[PDB]
């Protein structure tokens, strides 16, 4: 048998105490009141005393919303710490004000009544609380170093902690920024982009700085969405202190901001400044339109170059002409770049017409490159991740115009290329040139962002190729653990390229031989391995070790099993989960790319496509008016929402019930 | 520390009219009633 008892004891309650709060449960003002003023006179009763549960007289009147009794209580002078933050959690207006017309606790000692409004978010509260002076300090830097700030983390840092998430909890209220705030958008955004950094620094503490940034991003959508007028929005998103304010929430990834219907909407008319009825148009008609303009490029472009006051000069400084204007021109860059590719024993030979032609795209590219970082700057620069693929472009394209020059100047005869060196400064250029032909010709998937059905697929494939580079660390780590063995093994049977039947050596001959030889080769025969084209017969040797044999084969079973069975399968249903968390994101996400790559055509700089382009309190009040405007539709909106979700707990039926007995008490004193 | 006021100041109500209020959200007709007749 176990006994039981209470091994933490506390003081019990006596029998007419017990009375006085169950008769303040059922809230029999009658006998509250007689017992009260009984108690003025004898003592019996402790007016201030605690229940089995945790509450005391004061706390139950406040959650039971009962503020005759509530008030009654006040009026008698019980105890009153901490009731008014009691009050505020539960919600009870009547309570907040009469609380403020005037041991063991739930809250951290950090808790003040304007931060627990905010936690609240109760937009009645946190006004009747913001109405008296009343103030939050300030949390410090992210990365501070101040002498209080490493105090505070060495003396308690939990507290520390908990104090600097209680701030920014109290800070991202949706009504506490809908007041006391200037400018409640930029405040969203500051805010937002602060928590996120806040949740990359406190790995602990990660998912609640997260939710945090994600409700300011919702507050600052809501607010957008609440405007009625195309003019309302332009005021809105060309506020500065065009296009700033939009400027801004890209510059803080505001995504669900960006996405908005309406801002879409009027960012879609901006892009379609020439034609008016885009919108409305058959597929083939939109195709015939997109290649009449895309057949007229040099035209366009020379117009501009000749009159920019014309009907053709300007119309080139449309968004969507522009961007169809350097799409058409990098496209016939790539006819020509496939044109190059239909005597070849000259060493070091001048360009040829396609050549010729290639030059001035090439300065052109180089030179649009070296003038956006110019103009941009440097965190703009690099933080597109295309510049990187664009500078390699650039450098493979220099590096092959430098040795095709000191090709031609060094070398002059005609030499058959079976007997020319194996660094041959041509052969060098023309690797690079086809290296740099790749790359030109995959820089074109930045082209799928424009589209509507091929954006989230890229969009998509953003994402899971940071999976895939996840699993090539581990697949990398396989690799060159299995290519050391298989090396440790079988580098003593290396031999040597003239014993060959054809005198060639390693996995790219007819018969295969060495792939185990050396590392780099162990390294391409056990890559190569994973998609069949390396031979069972690699393991073999001249000698008769047949237990040297069935060991190297067993090592290239035991490594095929760990990638093709085991890996390649993981990788498959590491991308396959990672797809569904993607997928619901994928139109907000690529809605957000849309716009950046539309907005990166608004500008009058970088308008010629290569190889041409080598050749105030007004609006503040307005703003003031529009947002005030937000701030009264917004929420309206979020107490008709808060009056339209579900709400609803056991609280309710207590409330109902402590009405009911209260008239109950009441009607059984009158007759 | 971060000062909290009311950036977007609005008119406050008066203490009768506020009482006036509540009593309309409570039900009372005949406070109700009596408020209108008296404003009247
Ligand atoms: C992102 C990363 C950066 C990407 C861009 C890098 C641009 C780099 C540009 C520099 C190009 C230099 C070419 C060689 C000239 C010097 C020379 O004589 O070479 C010697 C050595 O040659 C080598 O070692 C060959 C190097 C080839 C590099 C190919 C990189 C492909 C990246 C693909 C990426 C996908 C010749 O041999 P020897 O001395 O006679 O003996
Ligand atoms: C001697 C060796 C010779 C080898 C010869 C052959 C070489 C072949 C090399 C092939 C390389 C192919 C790389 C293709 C990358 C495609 C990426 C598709 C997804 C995508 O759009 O990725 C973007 C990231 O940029 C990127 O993914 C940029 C990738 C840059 C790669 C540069 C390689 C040099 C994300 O989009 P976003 O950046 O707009 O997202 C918002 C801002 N973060
Ligand atoms: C991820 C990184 C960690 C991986 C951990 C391990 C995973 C499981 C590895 C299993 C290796 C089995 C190697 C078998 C072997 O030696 O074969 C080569 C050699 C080739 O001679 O096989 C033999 O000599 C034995 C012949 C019978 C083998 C039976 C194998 C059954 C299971 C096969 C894999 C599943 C499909
Ligand atoms: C892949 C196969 C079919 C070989 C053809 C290669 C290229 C000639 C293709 C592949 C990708 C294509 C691009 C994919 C998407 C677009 C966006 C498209 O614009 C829209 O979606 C129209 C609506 C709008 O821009 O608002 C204009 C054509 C373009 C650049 C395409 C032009 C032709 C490209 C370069
Ligand atoms: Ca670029
Ligand atoms: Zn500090």
């Given at each position: 048998?176990?006994?039981?008892?209470?091994?933490?004891?506390?003081?019990?309650?006596?029998?007419?105490?017990?009375?006085?709060?169950?008769?303040?449960?059922?809230?029999?003002?009658?006998?509250?009141?007689?017992?009260?003023?009984?108690?003025?006179?004898?003592?019996?009763?402790?007016?201030?005393?605690?229940?089995?549960?945790?509450?005391?007289?004061?706390?139950?009147?406040?959650?039971?919303?009962?503020?005759?009794?509530?008030?009654?209580?006040?009026?008698?002078?019980?105890?009153?710490?901490?009731?008014?933050?009691?009050?505020?959690?539960?919600?009870?207006?009547?309570?907040?004000?009469?609380?403020?017309?005037?041991?063991?606790?739930?809250?951290?000692?950090?808790?003040?009544?304007?931060?627990?409004?905010?936690?609240?978010?109760?937009?009645?509260?946190?006004?009747?609380?913001?109405?008296?002076?009343?103030?939050?300090?300030?949390?410090?830097?992210?990365?501070?170093?101040?002498?209080?700030?490493?105090?505070?983390?060495?003396?308690?840092?939990?507290?520390?902690?908990?104090?600097?998430?209680?701030?920014?909890?109290?800070?991202?209220?949706?009504?506490?920024?809908?007041?006391?705030?200037?400018?409640?958008?930029?405040?969203?955004?500051?805010?937002?982009?602060?928590?996120?950094?806040?949740?990359?620094?406190?790995?602990?503490?990660?998912?609640?700085?997260?939710?945090?940034?994600?409700?300011?991003?919702?507050?600052?959508?809501?607010?957008?969405?609440?405007?009625?007028?195309s003019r309302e929005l332009e005021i809105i998103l060309n506020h500065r202190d065009d296009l700033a304010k939009l400027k801004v929430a890209i510059?803080?990834?505001?995504?669900?901001?960006?996405?908005?219907?309406?801002?879409?909407?009027?960012?879609?008319?901006?892009?379609?400044?020439?034609?008016?009825?885009?919108?409305?148009?058959?597929?083939?008609?939109?195709?015939?339109?997109?290649?009449?303009?895309?057949?007229?490029?040099?035209?366009?472009?020379?117009?501009?170059?000749?009159?920019?006051?014309?009907?053709?000069?300007?119309?080139?400084?449309?968004?969507?002409?522009?961007?169809?204007?350097?799409?058409?021109?990098?496209?016939?860059?790539?006819?020509?770049?496939?044109?190059?590719?239909?005597?070849?024993?000259?060493?070091?030979?001048?360009?040829?017409?396609?050549?010729?032609?290639?030059?001035?795209?090439?300065?052109?590219?180089?030179?649009?490159?070296?003038?956006?970082?110019?103009?941009?700057?440097?965190?703009?620069?690099?933080?597109?991740?295309?510049?990187?693929?664009?500078?390699?472009?650039?450098?493979?394209?220099?590096?092959?115009?430098?040795?095709?020059?000191?090709?031609?100047?060094?070398?002059?005869?005609?030499?058959?290329?079976?007997?020319?060196?194996?660094?041959?400064?041509?052969?060098?250029?023309?690797?690079?040139?086809?290296?740099?032909?790749?790359?030109?010709?995959?820089?074109?998937?930045?082209?799928?962002?424009?589209?509507?059905?091929?954006?989230?697929?890229?969009?998509?494939?953003?994402?899971?190729?940071?999976?895939?580079?996840?699993?090539?660390?581990?697949?990398?780590?396989?690799?060159?653990?299995?290519?050391?063995?298989?090396?440790?093994?079988?580098?003593?049977?290396?031999?040597?390229?003239?014993?060959?039947?054809?005198?060639?050596?390693?996995?790219?001959?007819?018969?295969?031989?060495?792939?185990?030889?050396?590392?780099?080769?162990?390294?391409?025969?056990?890559?190569?391995?994973?998609?069949?084209?390396?031979?069972?017969?690699?393991?073999?040797?001249?000698?008769?070790?047949?237990?040297?044999?069935?060991?190297?084969?067993?090592?290239?079973?035991?490594?095929?099993?760990?990638?093709?069975?085991?890996?390649?399968?993981?990788?498959?249903?590491?991308?396959?989960?990672?797809?569904?968390?993607?997928?619901?994101?994928?139109?907000?996400?690529?809605?957000?790319?849309?716009?950046?790559?539309?907005?990166?055509?608004?500008?009058?700089?970088?308008?010629?496509?290569?190889?041409?382009?080598?050749?105030?309190?007004?609006?503040?009040?307005?703003?003031?008016?529009?947002?005030?405007?937000?701030?009264?539709?917004?929420?309206?909106?979020?107490?008709?929402?808060?009056?339209?979700?579900?709400?609803?707990?056991?609280?309710?039926?207590?409330?109902?019930?402590?009405?009911?007995?209260?008239?109950?008490?009441?009607?059984?004193?009158?007759?």
């Open positions: 048998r176990i006994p039981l008892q209470i091994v933490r004891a506390e003081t019990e309650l006596s029998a007419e105490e017990k009375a006085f709060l169950n008769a303040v449960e059922k809230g029999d003002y009658a006998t509250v009141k007689q017992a009260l003023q009984e108690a003025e006179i004898y003592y019996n009763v402790n007016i201030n005393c605690m229940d089995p549960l945790g509450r005391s007289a004061l706390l139950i009147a406040i959650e039971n919303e009962n503020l005759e009794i509530m008030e009654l209580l006040l009026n008698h002078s019980v105890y009153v710490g901490d009731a008014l933050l009691y009050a505020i959690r539960k919600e009870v207006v009547g309570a907040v004000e009469l609380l403020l017309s005037y041991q063991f606790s739930e809250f951290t000692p950090d808790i003040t009544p304007i931060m627990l409004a905010a936690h609240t978010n109760n937009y009645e509260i946190i006004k009747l609380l913001v109405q008296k002076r009343v103030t939050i300090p300030r949390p410090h830097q992210i990365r501070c170093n101040c002498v209080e700030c490493v105090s505070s983390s060495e003396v308690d840092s939990l507290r520390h902690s908990r104090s600097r998430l209680n701030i920014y909890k109290a800070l991202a209220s949706p009504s506490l920024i809908a007041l006391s705030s200037e400018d409640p958008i930029l405040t969203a955004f500051r805010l937002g982009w602060e928590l996120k950094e806040l949740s990359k620094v406190e790995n602990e503490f990660k998912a609640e700085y997260e939710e945090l940034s994600q409700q300011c991003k919702l507050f600052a959508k809501d607010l957008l969405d609440q405007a009625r007028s510059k803080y990834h505001q995504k669900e901001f960006v996405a908005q219907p309406n801002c879409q909407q009027l960012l879609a008319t901006l892009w379609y400044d020439g034609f008016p009825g885009w919108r409305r148009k058959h597929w083939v008609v939109k195709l015939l339109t997109c290649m009449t303009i895309g057949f007229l490029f040099p035209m366009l472009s020379i117009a501009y170059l000749i009159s920019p006051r014309s009907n053709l000069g300007l119309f080139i400084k449309k968004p969507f002409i522009k961007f169809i204007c350097h799409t058409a021109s990098y496209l016939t860059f790539l006819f020509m770049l496939l044109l190059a590719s239909q005597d070849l024993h000259v060493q070091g030979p001048p360009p040829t017409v396609v050549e010729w032609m290639i030059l001035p795209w090439v300065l052109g590219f180089i030179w649009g490159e070296i003038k956006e970082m110019w103009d941009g700057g440097f965190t703009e620069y690099i933080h597109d991740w295309w510049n990187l693929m664009d500078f390699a472009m650039n450098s493979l394209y220099l590096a092959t115009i430098s040795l095709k020059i000191v090709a031609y100047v060094k070398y002059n005869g005609s030499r058959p290329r079976e007997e020319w060196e194996m660094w041959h400064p041509t052969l060098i250029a023309e690797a690079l040139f086809a290296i740099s032909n790749i790359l030109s010709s995959l820089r074109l998937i930045s082209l799928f962002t424009a589209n509507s059905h091929l954006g989230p697929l890229q969009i998509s494939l953003g994402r899971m190729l940071l999976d895939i580079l996840k699993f090539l660390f581990i697949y990398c780590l396989v690799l060159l653990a299995f290519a050391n063995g298989l090396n440790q093994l079988y580098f003593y049977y290396e031999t040597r390229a003239i014993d060959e039947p054809n005198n060639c050596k390693g996995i790219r001959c007819e018969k295969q031989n060495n792939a185990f030889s050396t590392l780099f080769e162990t390294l391409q025969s056990l890559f190569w391995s994973v998609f069949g084209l390396l031979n069972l017969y690699v393991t073999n040797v001249k000698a008769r070790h047949e237990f040297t044999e069935f060991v190297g084969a067993t090592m290239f079973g035991t490594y095929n099993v760990i990638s093709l069975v085991v890996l390649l399968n993981m990788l498959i249903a590491m991308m396959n989960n990672s797809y569904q968390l993607i997928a619901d994101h994928a139109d907000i996400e690529w809605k957000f790319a849309r716009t950046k790559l539309w907005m990166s055509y608004f500008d009058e700089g970088g308008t010629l496509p290569p190889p041409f382009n080598i050749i105030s309190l007004i609006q503040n009040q307005h703003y003031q008016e529009v947002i005030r405007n937000l701030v009264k539709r917004y929420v309206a909106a979020m107490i008709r929402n808060s009056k339209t979700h579900e709400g609803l707990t056991e609280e309710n039926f207590k409330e109902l019930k402590q009405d009911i007995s209260s008239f109950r008490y009441e009607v059984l004193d009158l007759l």
